[PDB]
Each structure stands twice: as structure tokens, then as C-alpha cells.
Amino acid sequence: LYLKSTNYNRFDYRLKQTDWGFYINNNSNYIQNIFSGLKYIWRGLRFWIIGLLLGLSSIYYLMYVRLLPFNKIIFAWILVAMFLYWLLSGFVFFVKKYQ
Amino acid sequence: NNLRLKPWFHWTDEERSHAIFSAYEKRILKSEDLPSFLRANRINNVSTWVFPLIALPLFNQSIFKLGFAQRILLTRPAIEWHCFKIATVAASWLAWLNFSPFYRKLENEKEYLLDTLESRIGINVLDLNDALPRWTTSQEYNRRTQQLYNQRNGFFAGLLYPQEESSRPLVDIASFPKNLHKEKLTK
Amino acid sequence: NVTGKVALATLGALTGYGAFYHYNQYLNLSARWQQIQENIAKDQPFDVDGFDAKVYPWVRENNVNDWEYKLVKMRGYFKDQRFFVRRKRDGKEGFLVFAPFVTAVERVNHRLKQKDLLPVEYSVFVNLGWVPVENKKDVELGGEVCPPMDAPTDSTLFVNDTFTGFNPDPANPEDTEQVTLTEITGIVRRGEQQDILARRRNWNKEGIYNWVDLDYMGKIFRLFNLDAINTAYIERVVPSFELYPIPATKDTFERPLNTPERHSTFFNFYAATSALSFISMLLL
Amino acid sequence: FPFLEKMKYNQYKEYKNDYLFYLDFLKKEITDDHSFFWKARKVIKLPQYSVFSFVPLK
Amino acid sequence: FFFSRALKHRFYNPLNVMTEFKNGFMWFIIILINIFKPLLKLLENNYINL
Amino acid sequence: TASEEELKKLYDPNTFYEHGDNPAFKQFMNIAVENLREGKLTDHRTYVVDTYKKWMYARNWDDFLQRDCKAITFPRAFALWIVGTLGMATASKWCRQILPVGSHGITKISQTQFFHQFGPLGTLGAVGFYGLTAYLYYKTTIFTVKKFYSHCILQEREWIFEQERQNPGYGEYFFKDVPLSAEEHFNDLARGEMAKKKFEKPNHEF
Amino acid sequence: LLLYILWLEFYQFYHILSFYGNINWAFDYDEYIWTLELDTRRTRLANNYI
Amino acid sequence: LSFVYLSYRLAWVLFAYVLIYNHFLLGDIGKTFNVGEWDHRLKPSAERDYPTRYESLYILDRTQKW
Numbered sequence A: 001l002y003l004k005s006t007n008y009n010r011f012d013y014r015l016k017q018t019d020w021g022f023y024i025n026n027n028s029n030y031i032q033n034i035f036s037g038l039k040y041i042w043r044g045l046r047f048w049i050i051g052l053l054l055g056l057s058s059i060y061y062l063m064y065v066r067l068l069p070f071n072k073i074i075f076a077w078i079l080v081a082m083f084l085y086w087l088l089s090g091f092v093f094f095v096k097k098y099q
Numbered sequence B: 001n002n003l004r005l006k007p008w009f010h011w012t013d014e015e016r017s018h019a020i021f022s023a024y025e026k027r028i029l030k031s032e033d034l035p036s037f038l039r040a041n042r043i044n045n046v047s048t049w050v051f052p053l054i055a056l057p058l059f060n061q062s063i064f065k066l067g068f069a070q071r072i073l074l075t076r077p078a079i080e081w082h083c084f085k086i087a088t089v090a091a092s093w094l095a096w097l098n099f100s101p102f103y104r105k106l107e108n109e110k111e112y113l114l115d116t117l118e119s120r121i122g123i124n125v126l127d128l129n130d131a132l133p134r135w136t137t138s139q140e141y142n143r144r145t146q147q148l149y150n151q152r153n154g155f156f157a158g159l160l161y162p163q164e165e166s167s168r169p170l171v172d173i174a175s176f177p178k179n180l181h182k183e184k185l186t187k
Numbered sequence C: 001n002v003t004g005k006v007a008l009a010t011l012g013a014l015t016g017y018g019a020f021y022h023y024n025q026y027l028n029l030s031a032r033w034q035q036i037q038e039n040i041a042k043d044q045p046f047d048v049d050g051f052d053a054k055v056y057p058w059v060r061e062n063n064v065n066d067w068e069y070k071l072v073k074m075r076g077y078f079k080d081q082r083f084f085v086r087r088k089r090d091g092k093e094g095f096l097v098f099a100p101f102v103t104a105v106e107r108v109n110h111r112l113k114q115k116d117l118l119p120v121e122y123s124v125f126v127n128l129g130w131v132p133v134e135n136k137k138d139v140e141l142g143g144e145v146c147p148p149m150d151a152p153t154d155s156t157l158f159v160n161d162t163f164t165g166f167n168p169d170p171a172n173p174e175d176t177e178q179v180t181l182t183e184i185t186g187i188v189r190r191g192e193q194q195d196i197l198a199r200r201r202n203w204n205k206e207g208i209y210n211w212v213d214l215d216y217m218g219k220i221f222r223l224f225n226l227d228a229i230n231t232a233y234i235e236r237v238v239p240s241f242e243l244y245p246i247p248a249t250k251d252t253f254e255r256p257l258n259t260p261e262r263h264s265t266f267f268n269f270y271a272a273t274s275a276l277s278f279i280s281m282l283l284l
Numbered sequence D: 001f002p003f004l005e006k007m008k009y010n011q012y013k014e015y016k017n018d019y020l021f022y023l024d025f026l027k028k029e030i031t032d033d034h035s036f037f038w039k040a041r042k043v044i045k046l047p048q049y050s051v052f053s054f055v056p057l058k
Numbered sequence E: 001f002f003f004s005r006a007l008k009h010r011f012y013n014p015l016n017v018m019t020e021f022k023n024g025f026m027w028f029i030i031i032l033i034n035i036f037k038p039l040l041k042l043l044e045n046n047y048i049n050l
Numbered sequence F: 001t002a003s004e005e006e007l008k009k010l011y012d013p014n015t016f017y018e019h020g021d022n023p024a025f026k027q028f029m030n031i032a033v034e035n036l037r038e039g040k041l042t043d044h045r046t047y048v049v050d051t052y053k054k055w056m057y058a059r060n061w062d063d064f065l066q067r068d069c070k071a072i073t074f075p076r077a078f079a080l081w082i083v084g085t086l087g088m089a090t091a092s093k094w095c096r097q098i099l100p101v102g103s104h105g106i107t108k109i110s111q112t113q114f115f116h117q118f119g120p121l122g123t124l125g126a127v128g129f130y131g132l133t134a135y136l137y138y139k140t141t142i143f144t145v146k147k148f149y150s151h152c153i154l155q156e157r158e159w160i161f162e163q164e165r166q167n168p169g170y171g172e173y174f175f176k177d178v179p180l181s182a183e184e185h186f187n188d189l190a191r192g193e194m195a196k197k198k199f200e201k202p203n204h205e206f
Numbered sequence G: 001l002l003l004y005i006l007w008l009e010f011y012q013f014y015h016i017l018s019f020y021g022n023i024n025w026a027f028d029y030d031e032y033i034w035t036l037e038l039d040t041r042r043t044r045l046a047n048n049y050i
Numbered sequence H: 001l002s003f004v005y006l007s008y009r010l011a012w013v014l015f016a017y018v019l020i021y022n023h024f025l026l027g028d029i030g031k032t033f034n035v036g037e038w039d040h041r042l043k044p045s046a047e048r049d050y051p052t053r054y055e056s057l058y059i060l061d062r063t064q065k066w
């Protein structure tokens, strides 16, 4: 598939147009490290699959047993989510700043 | 009378198909009312997945040999020619799906079945409708009706699938006890 | 080759054993059916009256096999509800019709003026007859199965019975104790069981019934003596002549699933299979 | 407010799960099934018409 | 929800919208054709295998 | 012949029709006698017992645009179409940026960094995203064209919306000359006439 | 351990909030059916304060 | 950025709605407000326990639970 394929990608020319000395241009074939984005995607969602499965199943069960009206409760949950998230985001900002 | 609004004047195709399927499943519609409608249904399927095939060479003989098409073919890359052909065929396919003689025949057969239902149960035909699943389609409900017809009007009826003849007990529903109370929970 | 011979020998042995078992069952069933036919032709019904009408002899001694296909006679009032079980009689599709039959009533209320308690009714299921699928709509709710029993000629018999609790009084001063008694004669038969391969399977939710499930029939009709209902049921047999349901007679009462004809068919199938297996083994 | 009372359809809720006697229910006299009737709010002396329509104009 | 992201690509200009529609449809067609050509490759492989 | 004249006036098109209102009022009485049989309003609503088979209760995208977004009029439909056009253009640009095929001379999906990193799964995801966006845009375009044909060509309106437009809440427009102005000014003969027919009795042949 | 304490405290909290709706079964001897009845509750005020 | 922008747009629009409705559109409560409600599963389904914008399509009910 990559017999006559050049090394550079679009990002390589974009990098050659920038003063980013910390990034360099690839000079070898990418066959060795092909499909590494899937590896990093797995690593990103690795600790979240089991927790998300349990949490989403629990949330759906708790909604289903009570048959709550989806629009009203989703509006309420969006409001509560914004409330809690902005509180926790302010606290995360403080934790990060003081390093 | 064409001025009287039928009870299903607002139903979608999925709702009409589900109403027919529920009527057949609940033994309100017999297997003697389906054979026409079902037949039309099958034709409609063949009218959907064959049309692009039928429209592929015909355009090659009629539309894609015209001046505008030849100009596109000769003065634009082959990918743009493929894009033009696919877009034309897809637009024709969408127009066929919206306005198809066999689709009209299927809708007429469903309307006849709904008229039979209204003649049988009266205004309670509206009780056959529900809140359908979002991604279940009219074709899917028609296929379920066809499957139920094959199960009842064939082998294994009474062995793997319930029979079409009901054997419900003969009681007086005015006096027979009911499962649900009017307001409270009962045990 | 050798594997084929081994498979043929195993199949032949199994099918020969099946044929032998079915032949012995056919002999036993034919003998028992001849005995049953002779006993029925004797025509001496057992009168189920008094204590026997409250707790039945096949429930008290728990011997339904000793009381199977057995002529009995009992009096009571049928309840309105009817139950239909899909069945074929004489090779045409139809329904067996079952009705509750209250053979004894028990009153346990002592605050008669203050409270009007419902009586405790002891009932058994009676197979009224067979109605074709065309005429299932002709079965009427609360129909008259049999003409009501004649009033007794003994003036002392117009009181509530000691055991059954029935008053044979056409004009009863106690309106709440007024009963009409009809006297039926039938044969005690046992209940049926599920056999999917025999196409006797019932979908309770859909209302399709193919075999007599006495437990479910008792539960759905909100009857009381569920065990005495599950033990057996009485198939009504008219004396000589049989409009819907059509009652069974001495020669057309509903045949059980296990029949000498069925076992003969199974024996023929298994014997043919064993003979073919042995012929193929000899050829190989 | 007649469009709000869902007790009007409670008889239909029984057979959403117990299909057994649904067909017996369907063979019933139709009285107010899926229909709204507004009783007369005015005295109308028209003997020619047996029943009058007081459905809201909107 | 859609104003700012379209504003970035200057989609308030009707010409840019038409050009983007044409290019996006061509991109979709290219992807589908490149997906379905391996079927022809497998057909030729099946011929040689036969 | 007074009763005959009154009935003929009831069936006159200029009786229940005022300009700026529903043109179906030109044949109002006829329609009424076909629908308000026995004085009863048929309830076309569906009785639903919840099993959580639906959340949005929108049957299709047309229902969503008509009811959830309340694009009852044509200007609203065209505004939603403009929003959908911007969204579709943005989605097309995003898909062409993430999988640049046909942009810089690239002709194969293999020769993209997106395919190098994520492979065919990423291409499938991008195709699904573009297909969903194009499907929704097509549905929105069909809705907008239908609303343009109805409201602008056929001069149809959302007539309850028009009624709400005419009276700004607290106006004094209860007139004797207008039978539909109020409940007191609707003549009793019309009420009797619109309820003369009777419903058919179903034959319970099942 | 904090998860364990959270479950215990939530269990007690749920019980306490469940006190204030008196849900009982009432027998209707006329209809021979039990029904679920909802009612208020009366209790010593110290219980409400705690 | 999706969450950030969603939060900010919703906040601004809903706050504008609150101010405008509570200062300018209280003459007709029926026009500018909808009546909504949902109750416990133990109690029978509320009169206002229906999906809004579909009052002319569906009648929503549910079985009681305990």
C-alpha cells in the first residue's frame, strides 16, 4: 500500500512553514508504527470503559424504572451538570495554578 | 365522502404498517385480508432495490449521452463524471421512492386494510397505534406481518408459533375481575 | 466403512428397542381400552352425592387411575364462564368446551343480617362437549347444559343438605340460598400434560390453548378447590344421542393422546428403520 | 380540560398487557371512545334537531 | 451553535457554501468508490485462485 | 320557507368565512356535518402507555422541525434551513480537513495521516458523520421546500397561529355580525345542523 | 472505606425520608381486594428535628 | 470547547428568556407559559404529565408501581 508513497504528509509542510523547533519532520517510512492512533485511543478510554458501562447502565435503569419525561429531566440534568461542573472547574483551576 | 377525516388521517407510513401488524397479531385481521397487501409489499421491495439497476443503463442511453453530460465527461476529471452520474441516479432514485406506482399501490392496500379495521372495530382502530421505536420502519413492520403470515399460514403452527384461531375463555368482561384497578394498586 | 457399520448397528439396535417398547405398549393399551369399553357399556354410573360431592373419591383417595374413564353422576349448577381448548374430533377442527360445575357450597357467615358473605364453592371442571371452529361463536355464556333436576317428592328434602349445602327447593324462602340443580352424568378423566412434539402446547398470554391445563383453568376462573380441580375432570356423556357444544356419547368420548393406533404407527416406523439399518449393514 | 383527563382511557390500559380479553373488549358498545361530547350550555328550542353540537369553535 | 464555526471558513459568503458543497460531495464519492474497488480486486484474485 | 332560507344561508360560503381566516370556512358547514356527527368531536390522539420506546416523541425529522423547533411558518423554516446549510458546510469542511482526499493532489485514503493513525475505522467514522449530516440536511431542505410550496405558492397558513396573531390577547372583537367571533354569537341552527348525522355501528366480525 | 460509609449513610437517609409517606395495605371486605393507601404521619417533634 | 460553548450559549439565551418573560410577557400567562408536571410512579399519572408540543398527537399514561 505504501510502495511509492513519500515520507512527508500535509503536517510536514505545515511544520516546515512554522518556527516550531520542538517538532521535526519524519524522514523514514511509517509502516513500522502504522495504526498507532488506535493504540492511543484505547489508552485514552482504557479506564473509562467499565466505569462508563456501569454508570450508563445504572442511569438508564433508574430512568426506565420511573419512566421520567426525557425532555424535562434532561433539561434539569443539564442545569445541574453546569452547576457542578463550573464549581469543580474553578477548583481545578486553583489546583493547577498553584503548582 | 372525502370531507370526513379518517381516524388515521395523520398517521405516518410506519404507524399505518404497525397498526396493520398489530391488528393481524391480535387476531383482528384474518389471514384472508393480507394476501393482496402482502403481495403489493413484496413488489414495492422489488420496486426499490432494482430501480437504480434499471436506471443505470437507461441513462447511459438517454441522459448521459446528451450535450451537457458529454461536456462534463470531456472537460472534467473522471471523478467528477462519476460524481455527476451518481448524483443523477440518486436524485432519480429519491424521486422514484417518493413517487412510485407500486408505492401508491402499497399505500392503497394499507388504506383498504385500515378501512376494514374501522368497519370491524369502529373508532377503536385508533387503539392500534402506539409510540413506535424511532428506527423501526414501515418496511420492517410489513416484513414482520409477512413473517407472522408465514408462521401462521404454514408448518410449525401450533408447534413453534401460536395458531391464528383464538381460544380465549368466554366470560362477561363487565363482571369478570380485572388486573388493573382504576386508581390504586391491588394485590 | 467400519464407522458406517457401527452407526448402522447402533441405529438398528435403538430402533428395534423402540419398536419392541411401542409394541408392548400397544398390547397393554389395547387390553386396557377393551376393559374400559366393556366397563362403560355396563353403564352403572356412580352417584356422587353427600360427602362425595364435597371432596371427591378420586381426590380423597388420590386414585384417579382407579377412577379413570369412570362413569359418575353428580348434581350442581354450572358457572357462566366457558373455556375452549383446541382439538380435532372425527378429523375436523374444533374446540373442547369446559365449564365449572359447583357440586357443593359451604356458607361460613354467622353475621347473616349484617354481612352478605360470598359462599365457598367446591367445583369440578366438566367437558360439555366439542364445538367446531365455525360455531365457537354459537356457544352462549351461561347456557343451559342440561335441564334442571326435578323437585323431590319428600317434603323433608327441601332443606339445605348437610354436606353439599344445596337446597332442592324451587321456591326457597331464603332468597340468598336459592339454587337450581342440574344433574349430569359423565366419565372421570385425568388432566392432560404438555407435549410439544405432539403439537399440544398452549400460549396462555395469547389465549391459544391446545392441552387441558387444569391448574391454569382453575386459576384463571378464580375457582377455590384448585387441587381437587387439578386432580381430574368429568367429561359429560349423553345417553344415546348427541346444539353446541355437542356432548360426547358412549362411543365418541375424547380419545387420549396415547392410543394403540399411535403406538402401532411408532412401532411400524421403528421396525422399518431397524430393518433398513440391518439391510444397509448387510450390504456394507 | 377534557383533553387533559387521561382517566377517560383507563379502560384501554388494562389490555396493554392482558391481551386475553382485548377482543372481548373490542366487541363493546361505543359510547365515548376517542370522542369528546360537550353538554348543552344553552337552551335551544329546535324540535327538528335531536342532538346539538356544543364543540368549541376553535 | 453553527454561526462561529461557519464564520471561521467564511461560509457567510454564498459562493464558499456552494464550493464546499461540491467539494464535500466529491469527497464522499471518492471515499465510497475507493471502498468498493477492493471488491473488484477480490474478484480478480478469485479468478486467479480458480 | 323561512327554515329553508336559513339553511341555505348556513350553507352559503360567505357565512362562516371572514377574510384572513381559514378558507375551509367557505365549506365549513359541509365539513362540519361530515365530522361533528352526533355533536361529538373525534379524538385522533393516540393513547400511549410508556415503555420507554421513545424519548423525543418526534416521529420523523419533519415532526421535529414542525413541533420541537416550532417552524410552523415559512420564515422560520427558511431560517432553520440557513442554519442547516451553515452546519452542513461546516461538517463538509471538517470531513475534508480530517481526511484530505482530493485536496493536495491526494487520491487514495491510504495516503492520509488520518488513515495512518486510525485506519479504516476512522474512515468509517468520518463517512458516517458526513452521511448523517447530509441526511439531516436533505430532510431539512425537503421540509423547507414543502413549507415554501404550501405557505408561499398555495397561500396556506398555520391558522391557529394566524388567529393568535389577529387578537393580541386583550382585544374587544366579539361582534354579532361574526358567527365565529364568540360562543354567544354562534347561531343555534348551525349547532343543530352540524350534528344531524350519526356514526356507523361496526360489525364485530373477528 | 468512604464508599462503604457513603452507602451506609445513604441507606439511613433514604429510610428517614421514606418515613414521611405512610403507605399501607387496606382490605376491602366488600370487594375482597387489597388496595394501597397513602397517608400522612404524626410523630413526636424530636424525631422530626433529628 | 463544545461543552464550554454549549454552556455559555444556553446560559445567555435562557437568562434573556427569564428576564424578558418576567418583565414583558406576564399579561397572558396562558400564551407565554406551559403547564407541566410529573408525579411519583405510586400515584396515578398526572393530568399535565404528557410530552409538550405533542398534545394533539399522544395521550401519555403509565402503569403505577410500588
Ligand SMILES: CCCCCCCCCCCCCCCCCC(=O)OC[C@H](COP(=O)([O-])OCC(O)COP(=O)([O-])OC[C@@H](COC(=O)CCCCCCCCCCCCCCCCC)OC(=O)CCCCCCCCCCCCCCCCC)OC(=O)CCCCCCCCCCCCCCCCC
Pocket: A038, A041, A045, E001, E002, E004, E005, E006, F069, F080, F081, F083, F084, F085, F086, F087, F088, F090, F091, F094, F095, F098, F118, F121, F122, F123, F124, F125, F126, F127, F128, F129, F132, F133, F136, F137, F140, H001, H002, H005, H006
Ligand atoms: C470500534 C471503533 C472504536 C473507535 C475507532 C477509532 C475511530 C476514530 C474516528 C472517530 C470519528 C472520526 C470522524 C470525526 C468527524 C469530526 C472531526 C473533527 O475533529 O471535527 C471537529 C470537532 C471540533 O472541531 P473544532 O474546530 O475544535 O470545534 C470546537 C468545538 O467543537 C466548537 O463547538 P461549537 O459549539 O462552536 O459548535 C457546535 C457544533 C457545530 O456543528 C457543525 O458545525 C456541524 C455539525 C453537524 C450539524 C448538522 C446539522 C443538520 C441540519 C439541521 C438543521 C435544523 C435545525 C437543527 C436545530 C437543533 C440544533 C442542535 O460542533 C459540533 O457538534 C462539534 C462536535 C462534533 C462531534 C462529532 C462526533 C461523532 C463523529 C462520528 C460519528 C459516527 C457515526 C456512525 C458511524 C458508523 C456508521 C455506519 O472535533 C471534535 O468535536 C472532537 C471530538 C469528536 C471527534 C471524534 C472523536 C472519536 C474518539 C474515539 C471514539 C471511540 C468510540 C466511541 C466512544 C467515545 C468516548 C468519548
